[PDB]
Design a protein around this ligand. Structure first.
Ligand code: AP5
Ligand code: ZN
Length: 213
């Protein structure tokens, strides 16, 4: 089960990932989580990634492909994996084909979660993230059971610094700059499915899960 969960910032990739991972027990590999981990280690990689992330810019492709090479070569991905927000560029996409072709494998499904820009913006305005596990809530649209506390581990919730309005606008634009030619890459190789992400979390999930089996 070699999957890519694709979508613009705030499309519900993280939200849908928890469901796919919990159901099929394949590792969730998000580049954005990895960069935040490196920032928490305070590695040099993290310090350098963070300049870009704070602007809402992409982290350079070579850096990014790097950590993905390393990560997907770990034995826990041998039987499958859920890439989340990678690739975002044609060179990332290619380097992914190549590193998998070296292992006698390929990506088998790119699930592209589509949401209009205005909705994406509303989603990243009230978003909250768990200190303990990294899961996201939304104060309006998908709140925790108990205010301020994650439903999974009781973790405190907080606001990601890049979820401010200026950085969000930058993030949507930058990522969209990459999107159509990448859809065209995957659409042409016959693995891309578009998914209406603009409805209930459970309903988006059914659409995904249809494809997964
Ligand atoms: N491959 C790469 N190349 C280069 N640089 C890279 C890279 N990967 C990362 N980077 C760098 O790292 C940075 C951060 O990356 P990262 O943090 O991965 O991602 P992002 O692009 O910032 O967007 P997310 O993946 O955080 O959003 P998502 O769709 O998972 O949203 P969620 O499910 O929370 O949902 C959003 C909100 O909506 C709510 N919600 C979810 N589903 C629904 C629904 N159906 N209806 C209503 N509300 C919903 C949630 O509760 C939540 O509040 C980038 O800006 C870049 O600098
Ligand atoms: Zn949590």
């Amino acid at each position: 089960m070699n999957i890519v969960l694709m979508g613009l910032p705030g499309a519900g990739k993280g939200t849908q990932a928890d469901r796919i991972v919990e159901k099929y027990g394949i590792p969730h590999i998000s580049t954005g989580d990895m960069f935040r981990a490196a920032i928490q280690e305070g590695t040099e990689l993290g310090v350098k990634a963070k300049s870009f992330m704070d602007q809402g810019a992409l982290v350079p492709d070579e850096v990014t492909i790097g950590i993905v090479r390393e990560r997907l070569s770990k034995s826990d991905c041998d039987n499958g994996f859920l890439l989340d927000g990678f690739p975002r560029t044609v060179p990332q996409a290619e380097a992914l084909d190549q590193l998998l072709a070296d292992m006698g494998r390929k990506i088998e499904h790119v699930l592209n979660i589509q949401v209009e820009k205005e909705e994406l913006i509303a989603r990243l305005t009230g978003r909250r993230i768990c200190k303990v596990c990294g899961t996201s809530y939304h104060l309006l649209f998908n709140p925790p059971q108990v205010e301020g506390k994650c439903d999974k581990d009781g973790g405190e919730l907080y606001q990601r610094a890049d979820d401010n309005p200026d950085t969000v606008t930058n993030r949507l634009e930058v990522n969209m700059n990459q999107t159509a030619p990448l859809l065209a890459f995957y659409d042409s190789k016959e693995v891309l499915v578009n998914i209406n992400g603009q409805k209930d979390i459970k309903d988006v999930f059914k659409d995904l899960d249809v494809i997964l089996q």
